[PDB]
Structure formats: structure tokens, C-alpha cells
Amino acid sequence: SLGSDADSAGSLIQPMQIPGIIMPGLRRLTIRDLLAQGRTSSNALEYVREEVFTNNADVVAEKALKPESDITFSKQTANVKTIAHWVQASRQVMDDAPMLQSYINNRLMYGLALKEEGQLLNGDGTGDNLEGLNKVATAYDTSLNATGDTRADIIAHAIYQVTESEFSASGIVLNPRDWHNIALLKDNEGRYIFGGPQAFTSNIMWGLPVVPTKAQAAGTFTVGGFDMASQVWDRMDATVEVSREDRDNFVKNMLTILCEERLALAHYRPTAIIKGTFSS
Amino acid sequence: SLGSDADSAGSLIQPMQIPGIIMPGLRRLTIRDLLAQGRTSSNALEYVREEVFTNNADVVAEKALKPESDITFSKQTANVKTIAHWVQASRQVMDDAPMLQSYINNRLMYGLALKEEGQLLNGDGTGDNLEGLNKVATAYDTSLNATGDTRADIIAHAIYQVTESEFSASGIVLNPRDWHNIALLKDNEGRYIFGGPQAFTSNIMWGLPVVPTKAQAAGTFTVGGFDMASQVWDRMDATVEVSREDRDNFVKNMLTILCEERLALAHYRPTAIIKGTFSS
Amino acid sequence: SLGSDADSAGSLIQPMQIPGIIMPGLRRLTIRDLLAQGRTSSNALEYVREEVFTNNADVVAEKALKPESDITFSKQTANVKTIAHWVQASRQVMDDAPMLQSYINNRLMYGLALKEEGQLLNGDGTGDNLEGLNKVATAYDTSLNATGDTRADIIAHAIYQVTESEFSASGIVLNPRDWHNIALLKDNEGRYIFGGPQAFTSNIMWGLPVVPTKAQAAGTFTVGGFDMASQVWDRMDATVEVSREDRDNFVKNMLTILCEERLALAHYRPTAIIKGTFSS
Amino acid sequence: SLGSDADSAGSLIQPMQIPGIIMPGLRRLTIRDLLAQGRTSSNALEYVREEVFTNNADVVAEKALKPESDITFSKQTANVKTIAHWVQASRQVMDDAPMLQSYINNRLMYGLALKEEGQLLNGDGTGDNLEGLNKVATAYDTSLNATGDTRADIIAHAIYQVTESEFSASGIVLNPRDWHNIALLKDNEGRYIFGGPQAFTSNIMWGLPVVPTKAQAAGTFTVGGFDMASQVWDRMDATVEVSREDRDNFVKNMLTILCEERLALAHYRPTAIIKGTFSS
Amino acid sequence: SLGSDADSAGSLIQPMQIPGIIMPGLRRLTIRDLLAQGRTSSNALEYVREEVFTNNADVVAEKALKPESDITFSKQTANVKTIAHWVQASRQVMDDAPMLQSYINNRLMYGLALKEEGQLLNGDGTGDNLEGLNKVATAYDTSLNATGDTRADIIAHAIYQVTESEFSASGIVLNPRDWHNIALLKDNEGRYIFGGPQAFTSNIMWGLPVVPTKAQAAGTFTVGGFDMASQVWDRMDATVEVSREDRDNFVKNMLTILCEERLALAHYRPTAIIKGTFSS
Amino acid sequence: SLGSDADSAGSLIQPMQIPGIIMPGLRRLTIRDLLAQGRTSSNALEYVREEVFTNNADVVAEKALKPESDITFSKQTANVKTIAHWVQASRQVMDDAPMLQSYINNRLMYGLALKEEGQLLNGDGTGDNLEGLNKVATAYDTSLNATGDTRADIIAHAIYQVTESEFSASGIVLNPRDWHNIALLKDNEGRYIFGGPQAFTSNIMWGLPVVPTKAQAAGTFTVGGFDMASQVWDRMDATVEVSREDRDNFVKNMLTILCEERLALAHYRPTAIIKGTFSS
Amino acid sequence: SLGSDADSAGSLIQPMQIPGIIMPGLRRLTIRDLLAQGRTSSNALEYVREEVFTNNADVVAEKALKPESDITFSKQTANVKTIAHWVQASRQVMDDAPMLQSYINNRLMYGLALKEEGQLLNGDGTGDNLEGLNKVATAYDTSLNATGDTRADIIAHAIYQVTESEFSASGIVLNPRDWHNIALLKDNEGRYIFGGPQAFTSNIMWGLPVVPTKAQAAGTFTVGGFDMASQVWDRMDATVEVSREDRDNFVKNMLTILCEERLALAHYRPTAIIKGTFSS
């Protein structure tokens, strides 16, 4: 029998090629869009804030010595760090697969911006890393939690703790999973607090927008007045350059694709941001 | 006594014939329409996707060696298979009842497409069976279920799980029976969550359309972004041929009616589909 | 004293006549108008339907034996029966009260049609009786009932069982009393599911119309797609004739008023009709 | 001292007169306006209705004996009764107090009309009394009540019973007290079904108007299709006449004021009216 | 070191006196505005009402003696009374504090008006006092109360009792305290029957206005058709006069300030007012 | 290696200056705005209020002796106090940072006004402190509470207690945190009484504005008719003066910035202010 | 002999009536005339006294610290009292003698002014009495008397003692009898101490004015600086009013003539007033 198996006639048949490269799920970027954005041409920013206001004003008896008050100020420095990564590709690979280049570009670009989010939110603070929202932030006050509160109640309490600093909250940054569990929250009857089975409620809780990014660690939540608490200072926009002569390269038939960016994350009022943890 | 009895005069009376054959209910097809369609002329398809993106983009000190990143790709093959069935009928019958062939055709056609759905959805993966939505799909995360969730809560949970792929779902495929029990879902008060007795709620749950096909196994549910996860590739449309000489027909006054079709089911993004089981 | 008693002058006084005869509540006919109608001129109808479509289509390996399928058919017969009744009245009565004849006709006609409905629905299917919707119908699936379903829930389930045939339900035929006890259905709070005390809810349950006929025995309920599951075949329109010489009439100054009709109830798709019982 | 009591100057002071007589509350007449009205000039009315329509129409075998049906009629008589009362006052009083004349009229009129309503509803049937709604009315069907029905639920069952006569109900005649208790009906939560503290609900229950007349015995209720079940036949409109010579009047300077009226109450369809008793 | 002590110069410092007197809480007068008002110029008022209307109208046999009816009238007198009080102050106090004069006016005025309310509502009826709404009123009917009625349910029953008179109620006179406790009535769910936390419900219960006056004894309630059940007749408006020579005075350097008013309270229909007690 | 650090070329790089000085959360001032305001030029205020009004106004017979009444008055004193504080700054600092003065002013001005709030609310009476709202206040009436009242219910009762004074409540002075835990108040079913999870309800409870000041002690609540009950009297408006000669300043190049003000808080009607404690 | 004695024409002559009664009243200064006078519209007076004036003024070397002085003040109160008396006279008398009322007025005022002087001097300072000159005075300094010097010498010594107050003595207040004697004081030879009968002046001793008042207790003497150390404050000048209706006047044809006056007296320096006793 003359079949289609490989060891028979299969060879006479060419598999049909499906144009295109199947790109993975592209994550939606945020956080950065929550912050105030500026632009500089220096390697660092300096701003000044009042540190300690010792207000001793009080009532005074006649003929008596009045109270002495004092104010303190401090200078804060925000450095401009550099983020980047590169890739090396065979002169051949690049020539044999044309579109491969434009693909590698769009990936380093995204990748860069992805790790960028990473700093902005959970910025370690260690040596060269940026200091991010979640680090600068003031801890959530465990005392507001009351016997039997829905996770929803907590975020509420949180929006309040921002008020104690005397500023308006801007939004809520929950983890996609946490957000979900909050929406499907029910009442003692069985009804949906945010939205009956027809459709998921919109991304708005307690009057504020809700940003669900995977960037936010599962089980952690961040509430603040972002648009006014911190600011992102761009020194150099993300860019892609290519070198064929970089060291070894020429003599090895190699290319080097580079992608870098220069930022600076400033935190003006940390009292305006809050990080906390749901107690499960 | 001259009556309408058999053993009397009944014989003189001819029963009135009712035109045509009474065809049973025709199941409404679906699954297929949820997928992307296109045709080919090969015995198999080849598409290419990105495998591992090793993104080391990071923060870099001045004068320091930046980080090296990498990308990986893989070629995936999707084979074409063959679906068909045949009927053997006497030469006598066929000649005596004219429109019988016409009917047998329309019947095999349908019957074929019926089983076609079968594969597309519950495609085993063994031997030759197609790799169907339900197999490819990433398993439902039992983790999301919570103490006291309605079946609807789960479908919801599932709609979410699709998000972890970074694409949105496009429909819910439940079994007609399960769908019913979900619609008649009541609250602690005895009210209908979907529709007060006046009329059944539409086929829309959690913002997404609902596809109730018997094809879907009882107690099994499927949620995903079909229109972007898989594609059906037709090689040869459904067709019908007839043979007078097949096997030992000529010598038995027999005909053979054959109906076949050639497909290929491709699965680009599995992470975009989810298979689950109500556990109750 | 000259009074208006009997034994005085009351005799001189003529009672005023109220024109016309006071006719009892006229019942509203229905069952018939739910079915498809057509006339014939035979003593029986014959039609043919598909019985068992054994569809084995499947996936087939290269150069491997394909699956064999089959189809079955059955010839179904539907006899036409005769419904009628007669009345015997005196020549004298008939002559002394002109309008009496007219009345008697309209009455036999109605009374006949009344019992006609009786057959169409609860037709015993036995001896000479017609085969009624309720005998043909496929029994309600007891497995759909769930802990704590209201009567309403059941008709709901029922409306579904019609779907397993692949046809849409047409209406719900309940007993006038049962309909009532359903409307006054309350929730766990004592609220009226269909309509607060303000006004009775319309005769529409689960999107379908509701037909309340006393014909439907209390405790029994019928749901189906009548408009195309059965058909009524009229052989002889209901008519009225009169004989003066019947039996020994001529010699007793008697008249005989006869009213007959010839029907036939055909049942094409039984899977499209469902009968059940409320077990309270 | 010159005081304003009797013995002193009290006399010089004239009390101020409040114009007009203070009439007691006037009940609002109703039960009459519910029935159909008509004129007559007779001593009584006669009408004819069908009694037993023995309808045996059925299915009949071939060459078999048809079934015999029958009809029964009866003659019903409604007598005309007389209601009235007179009042005699002195010629002096009548001449000295001008408006007393008219006042006395409006009173006898109303008074008559009051007892009139009395007959119409609770008409004994004994001797000379009229036969009224509540007597004729068909007894409520205790079998419709169900464990845990509100008084409202009953009146609903009632409105239905009217339907078993194939006629629509016209209104509900309750006792002002009972109506009240029904409006303040509450649910298991404590909310008012019709009420809701802001204001009393309108006089409409189950789609029908509600007539609250004291005439209706406390604890008794009447539902029916009045405008089509009974008719009031007026022989003589309520009138007022005066006589100066009536018996020893002329010689006693006396007057006699008379007020009479002639009615007849007919009850065509009794099955259209229902009388019941709240049992609790 | 001279300061503001009593030892240094704080003597040369005289406090600044805040102009005028601090008048206490002036309550809202009401009871009066509920009643019909009119003026007169007499020692008292006389009005005439119907007493016993003996209506014997009935059904009368033929040529039989008809029923005799009767009407009784009575003349009711309503006397005018005098309400007043005076206050004497030293010529010195009066001359030394200029505005003390006008203050004593506004106080005697208000004070008078206050006790006026006193009579109008809870008027004793004894000796020289007035008969007040509450004395004349017909007692509440304890039999209307039902197992578990709210205080509101009662006032409701009350509003009905006013119907047995055949007039509509006009308002509800409750005690400020009782009102409050009613407004905050809740359901078994914890919801506010009259108004969710946002705002106190308006002073309207069962469709009627509500007057909360301290005048009304705590635990007591009054519902009636005030606007036309009683009427207030003014003979002399409240007036303030001053005497320099009253008895001693001239020789005791004293002044006498007098404030009087002349009323008359008429009660046309007592069956129109109800007085009851929340018994709990 | 030519780098950016200090040892290399860093020096050539000028950090970008963020214009402006970062001021902390500025608290919103209130309370003072709830009170009536006025001037004065003394070191204390003296006002007069009515104490006991013995109103014997009554009904009097003719020629009868009228009743005598009386009025009592109290004199009350409210002293003027002095609140202030000063800051000593270098002459150089002040000239080298132009806007530093402008800032120090708004900073003292504020701090002053802040401790001012302090007195006005939680006064004391102790020596130099002001006697404030919460001290003068009338105790909350514990008898108004009822089995199962929510915090809200209490403020409600409180808003009533202010009625006994015969004045209207003006606002509710809660502690920021209490207000929060009040808004998130839920019902027996679990849904939010004030705002669901959509958005925070506005600062309005029982129809009155809500004033949340940190000044108000946690757990303490104050309801009253502020705009009527008390009045703030200013002797000296909060002002700021500067001296270059104070003490040994001239010779040490120092400035002294002084900020003081002279108040006096008067409480006319205490019955109009209620203070209470939430017992958790 | 027509003469003018009784028995003749003496009757023709009517005596002329001397128009007007000559009113008494000495020509002398009054304890009043000696004091400073003012006016007030108040119930009392609040003045201030200088107590201790530590005057350390002195000579000072340049570059040297100057001397500190100090002043002490004290707050004093002085109430206003009332002096008055009335006369009851016949209305007839008062009309028949016109000049009579004019007298009674002046005479009642004169008499008032006497008792006025009385309080101004020997004012008990107790209950209703005024705080008089003598109650305040510092006692005379016996240590100034010389071996054998006249009563005159003493008053002279007193005039000196005043000086130690820092005020000049204004006048002398002796008893009439005493003054009469002190004036006729002679030496051991007969020459008058004062001035011979040649050019005798008046009430002037030691160049001061002298008030000879029977108010000044015999044997007592008052010397001080009246014109400045103390002053009279008038609230109401002496006035006369009349009442025709006073108590039972109207009905007795009587008139009541009242004469009152109200003042107060303040003493700014007691040390400036001196009282002593003549030891003889």
C-alpha cells in the first residue's frame, strides 16, 4: 500500500505554512500612567520638604513667657537610574528571516517597559534599583479592621487612612485575582454586591478607579493618591540601536541589538500611599 | 349491515396519504462557528510561536556591562484527519422509493457534521481523533472555588482564569441541562437571580454569550476566547458518492452510499481555553 | 278593601316580560386552536416518519475500514372517528315556541365542540376514542425536579424537556385552578412572585402563554409545541339535521334534532409534548 | 357690682348665632350603583333561564346508537315591593322654621335610600323583604383556601370562583373594618404589602375596585359580577308628598310628610356572586 | 509689674455687656392652627345640631299602616372665657433697664398663648376651664389592635376610627418623643421604614400631616378631622397693658403689666376626634 | 575612565531643582465656622439669660382676681484668653531664602488657629484654657437608646435631644474615624446602609451636615445648634509681628516672629449642645 | 354814723388774701454743695481707687539701670438708693386753693433735701442707707493736739491731717450749736478768737466753708477735701408726681402727691475725709 506515512509517500506532500509568529499574551501596562510625568536633562533631582513642625502654640497667662515653636526642612535627592538589556543574533539568522529583526525590537521594547513597571511598583531600594511605590508607602493600620469585614471593607478603611494624611485617594491597585474575589462578593441573601450575574461590575470601588495588574503581588494591595504623591522623571526615552562592529561581532558574523531607557522615580508625599495585606 | 370494517367494505376506502417524510428535530450546530475558519490543500499545517522569552532587562550601573536577553521559538504541526460514514441499501428499495436517496444524502451530511462538532469539542487526542478544545485547554483552577459558590460563581471564576493568559474570553459552552439549572438559580429568599417567572433570562451570563450544545458533556463546562485560540482548516468539504460495484454489491443488488469530509484543528493559544467540572 | 292579592284584583295585573332566554356561562374553547388544521375526505390518515437514525460517522485512519450507519422508518396510521348527540322534542313545543329551535341548535353545536375538546386533550386512545395530546405525550422527567422547586419551577423544567426534542414549546396547558394557585405563589418573605396585590398577573409564565382549560384534569399539566406536533383533520364539519319521520316520531308528534361531526387527530412528533403531575 | 350674669346685665348681651343646622355624617350610598338599573310599570317581573343542560355528546361506534341529550328551563318571578316612612310635624313648627321643610325632605329621602341599600345587599327574602345579593349568592368554596393564606389571598380565591361561572368579577364588597385590616397586611419582614407608612393604598385589590360599605356585615365579604348578575327595577322613584287633611290633622293644625318608593330586585345569574366568611 | 489682677489694674477693666436678653427656647404653637377660626363679639355662641334621627323607613305590606319616623334637634351653647395673667415689677428695675419693658411683653404674650394651647388640647372641662379636643373626643377602640402591631399600626387604626364618623381625618397629634421613636421604626432586616439614614422622613404618616407638640401628654395620641370638627372663636386678641396707679403701686414705686385674651371653643362633631394610649 | 561620580566629572552635572517647598497635609478648619462671631474691646464678656419663667397664666372668672407670674434672670461671665507662640530665626537665613518669611507666617498662623480649634471644642475652664463646647454640653440622654440601636440611631436620638431645647440641630461633630465606621454600617443582610460599594456616601446623616475633626476626641460625639448656642468673641484678630530688637537680637542678628490672638468663647444655650459616648 | 365795724357796714369789706405762703429754708451751703456732682443712668457705680503708689523715681548715673516704680489700684462699688415721701390731700382742697399745690411741692422737696443731707453725712452704709461721709472717714489724729488749745485749734489740725492724703481740705461740717459756740470763742482776756462783731462774715473758718447741719451729731466734726475726694451721683433729680387713682383715691376724692429722688455717693479717697470728737 502506498500511504501518507513518512516511511512511504508522505514526503511528496508539503505542509502548508501559516504566516506569522504567534506572540504570547501581551500584558497591559499601567502604574506608570497613574503617576505624574515630567521630563529632565540631569542625572538627578533635588526637592525640599518640611520635616518637623514643632507647633507649641498654646494659651498663655498674663505677664508670662510665651511658647517657642520651630520648623525643620530637609533636602531630598532622587537619582536617575538606567535600565536596559541587549540581544546577540547571528548575521545569518537575521538575513534568512527578514521579519525577525522588527520582532526582536518590539520585544526588547516591551520587555524593558515591563521591568520598568516592576521598579515603579515594587522597587526594592537596594543599591542601584529604584525605590517604588510599595516601599515608600506607609503601612496599613491594622486597627481599622473590625470583626467580620469583607475584603471590600478593608480597601475602604485603606482609602480612609489616606485621608489621615489629609489628601485624596486616587485609585486602588489590587492583584487581578484579589479583584475578582472582591467582585463576586455576596450578601446574606445570595445577591451580588457589585453586580447580578448579568455582567461583572465595572472597575470602580468606593468611588475610585481600580487598577488590577499582575505587577501587584498576590495578596497585597496599594491605595494612594498617586497622581500627586510621586512623579516619574524621564531622562531618555526607550530606544533601540544596532551594532555590527561591537567587539567580537564583525569577525564572528554577529549582530547586537540594544535597548535602554533612563528614569528617575521621585516620592514627594509617602504619607499619601498605603500598602497592606489581606488576612486570609 | 354493510360497514366500514375490514371484513366488509372498508377495502373500498383508501387512506389519505400525507406528503413527505417526517424528519426529527435538527440539532442546531455551533462549536464550529465559534472558531476561525480557512481552507488548505495540504495534509497538515505548520505554524510558529515564541517559546521562552528570557527577559533580563534590568538596572545597570554606569560603566557597567549591561544584561543579555534571549528569545526562543518552536515549530508546531497540526494534522489533517478524515471523518466519514457510509450506508448500504438495497437496489430494490432505492428504485421503488425515488426520493429516498435524496433523503439519505441530507441525512448523512447532517449526521457527519454532528459528529464533526463532537471532535472539535471533545476531541480525545488518541490515535486519530482530533485534538479538541476540551483536551488542549488548560485545566480549571480548583483553587478559585470558595466555600458556598453557585455553579454560576464557577463559570465566573473560569471567565477570570482566561485573563491569566492575557486575552479575554468570548463565550461559555455549557450543557443545555446545566444551563437550565443555572438559570433557575434562586437566592435565600426564593427569588430568581436571572429572571422572575415572567420569562427565562437571555443566554448571557457574566457579560458573555452562552452556547448550550448537547455536544458538551453533561457536567462539563468550557470557557475561552475561541475566536482567537483555534482555527478549523477544511481540506475537503463534505461530499457524497455512490457505488454499485463496491465489494460484493453487484452480486447482491446493493448500493453503497458514502459520505466523508477532511478537517484539521489547529490550536494556537491553549492558555485561552479552560475545561472544568462542577463538583457537586 | 280592593287589594292586589290573588283573590282580589291581582289578576288584572300583567307581569312584565324580560325578553330573551338567560343562557349560562359560555365556556371558552381552546385546545383546538393550538393545533394545525386541515381537512380530508377519507376514513383514515397515513404518514411516515424516521424512527432510529443510527449514526456512526467517526474519524477514520488512512486506508482503514469506515463506519456503517443505518436509518429506520415507520408507517403510522390515524383513524377518523365520529362525535355526535341528538335531542328529541315534541312537535307541539317546537311550534309554540319558534325561537326554541334556534336555541337548541346553538346548544348542540356547542355541547358537541365541548366534548370535542375533551377528546383532543384527554383522548383515552382506547376503543373509539381519539388519541389525545395527553396519551401520546412523553412523560415528564422526574429527574429534573430539585429539592425545593415550586410548581412554577416544574413547568419551567417541562418547558425545557421540550427542547430535548429540538423544538420550541408553544404554550402551557394547566387546569384553571392550578393556574390560580400558581399565580398566588409566594416567596420566603410572603411577597407575591408574579404580582403584588395590586393586580393579577397576566397569563404568561416563563415566556410562554398559558391556556387554562377545565378540560385539563386538575393536577395534570401539559406542555409542548402543539402548533406543529399534532394536527386535527376534519372529515365532516359539525352539522345539524332534523327528522320528522325518525323512529316512531310521525305517530307521536315528535321531532329529532341531530348534531354530529367527524374528526381525526394526527400526532407527528410526540417528543414535542409533555404530560406530568404535581406531587403535593 | 354690675356683672354680666343673669341677675345683673347679662340680659343686655345677645348670644351669636351660628347659621345652619349641624348634620351628622352622611354614609355614602353604593351597593345600588353596582347593579344594572331599569324601569317598569308592573307588579312584578318574569324571566326565563336554562337550568340543566344534560349534554351527552360523545364518540360513537359505526352503526351504533347515538347518545340522547336534554335541556331544562325554568321561569323565575321577582316581585315589586314598597319601601316608605312618614313623619308628622305641627303646622306651627313648619311655618316658624322655613328651612325645616326642605331639611325633613332630604332626611326622609336619604333614610329611605339607606334602608333601600339594606335590602339590596342583605335582603332577607322573608315575607315582604326584598331578596338581596347576599341571600342569592353562591357560597364560597372552602376548598380553595390553603395553609397560610392572608385574608387577601382569600378574596383572590373568591374572585376566581366567580370565573368558574365563566364570568368576570365586577368588584369586592367588604366591611370598612375588614378592608382596613387587609390594607395593613404585612410580610415576614415587617413591610406593608399595599401600604408602606407614607400613605394608605388605593381602594383596589387584585385588579378590582373595592367597595367598603357599612351595609356589609362585619366579617362577611361579597365578590361578584354585579353589573351582569342582578338588576334593579324601579317602579316608582323615591318621592315626597305632603298632606294637610290626613286624618285628624286639619283639626289639630298638623301636617304629614310622606316618603315612599317601589323596587324590585332581580337575580339573573347567581353563580356570578359569592359570599364568604373570614374564619380566624 | 502691674497687670489685670484685682490687686493691680484689672479693676479699670469693665466687662462688655452683650446687648439684650437671651430668650429661651420658644416652642412652636400648633393645636390652634388645626382648628377652624372665626371672630365674634359676644358673651357666647349657640349652634344647632340634629340629635336623634329615628329612621324607621322599611318595607311595607300592601294597604298596611306605614312606619312613623322622627327627628330631634338640640341647642348647644359654647361660652366665651377669659385667659390672663399679670406681673408687677419695681419702677426702678423698669427705669434702669430700658428693654425689660418690651421683654416682659413678648413673654406674657407667649406665655398666654402657651396656656391657650393648653386648654385647646387638654382642656379640663371643669369649672371655668375650656373643653379641649382631648376631653370631647371619642375614645380609641382597643379592639382594633392586633397581635404585634407597631405604634404606627395603631395611629393607622386610629385614622380609621375617624371614618366611623363619616369624615376624613385631618392630622395626627403626637408627643415629640413618641414621634421620634416611630420614625426610627425598623424592619426585621434593619432597614428604616420611614427613612434611610440620609434624612429624617417628613412629618407625614398614613397620608396625614403630623404635629409633634409637647402640649400633647407623652404616651397619648390624638387623631381627628380638626379642620371641621371644632372651631375657635376669638372675642379679644391678646393684649398687653400697663398700670402705674394700680392699688399700692404709686406709693410702692411699682408697675403692673397685664396680658389677657378672650376665647371660646366650639365642638361641632366629637365623633370626629380620637384620643388613645399606646399601651406598652 | 571618565565617569559621572565625584572623583571624575560628576561636578560638571547640575542637579535639577524642583521649584517650591513641599508642605504637609493641611487640615481643614471647622468648628469656628459653626459658631456665631463678633468683636469686643474688653477682657471678658457679660451676658444675661432668663432662668425661671413661672407662667401662671390661666382662665379667670368675671370680677375675679387674676393670676400673678414672675421671671428670673442670671448673669454669666466669659473671660477673654490669649493664645500664641513665637519663632526665633536667623537674620541671614531670612535674607538668603526670600519666601521663608512668607512661609513661616502661614505656618504660625495655621498652628495658632489649630490650637484655637482645640480650645473651642475640647475646652476646659482650668485657669487659662477656654471653656469649650464639650464642657458646657448637656449630657446625652441614655434613656433614648433601645434594644438594638446602631451608632447612627444614637446620633439620631441625639439630634432629637436638641429639640427639647426647642432649637434646631445644626451639625454633627464626630471623630473622623467614627464617621468612617459609621458609614460602613451594614444591615442584618449585609448590604451598606449608606452607600453600597459604589461610592462613599456624602457627609450627611439624618439630614444634617457632618463635621469630622481630629480635634473631636475618638469615641466622643457632639450634636447641637451651634450657630445659636455659642458665640466666639475676638478681642484681637490672629496677627503676626516681627521684632529685630527683642532681647539680645540686634546684637546677634536674629529675628523674632510672633503670632498671637485673643479669644473668648461664650455659651448662651447649653441645652442646645449634646455630648455623648458610643459604648462599644 | 356809717362805720366799718361788724354792726355797721364792716361787712361790705372783704379782707385781701395774701397770695402765697412764705416758705422756710435757710440760706446756707449744703453737704451737697460741698461735693462734686455727676449724673448716671444706672443702678450702681463702679469706680477705682489708687491704693499704694510706690514711687522710686530718683537720680541716675548714665549707663546705669534706672529705678522701677509701681502702682496699685482697687475696685470699689457704690449702689444707688431711693429717698422719698408722699402726702395725701383732698381733691377739693387742691382745686379750691391753687397756690396750695405749688407749696406742697416745694415743701416736700425741701424736706427731701434735708434727709438727703442726712444720708450724705451719717450714712449707715448698711442696708438701704447710703455709704456716708462719716462712715468712710479716717479717724482724727489725737497725737496732734497741743497742751491746751481751743476747739478751733483742733479743726485746724484736722485741716492739716487731710494733707497726708495728697488732697487739700475743702470744708468743715459742724453741728449748728457747736458752730455757734466755736464762733464766740474768746481768749483769756475777752477779745474774740475769731473777729469782733465788726466785720463778721459767715460760715467760714480757717478760710474754708462751713456747713452747720443738725444732721451732724452734736459734738462731732467732719473735715475733708469734699470738692474732689467724693462725689454725688444723681440718677433721678427730685421730682413730684400726682395720682388721682392711687388705691382707693378715685372713690374718695383724694389726691396723692409723691416726691422722690434717687442718688448714690462715691468716695474716691477716704484719707481725704476726717471725723473726730471734741473732748470737753
Ligand SMILES: [Cl-]
Ligand atoms: Cl488785734
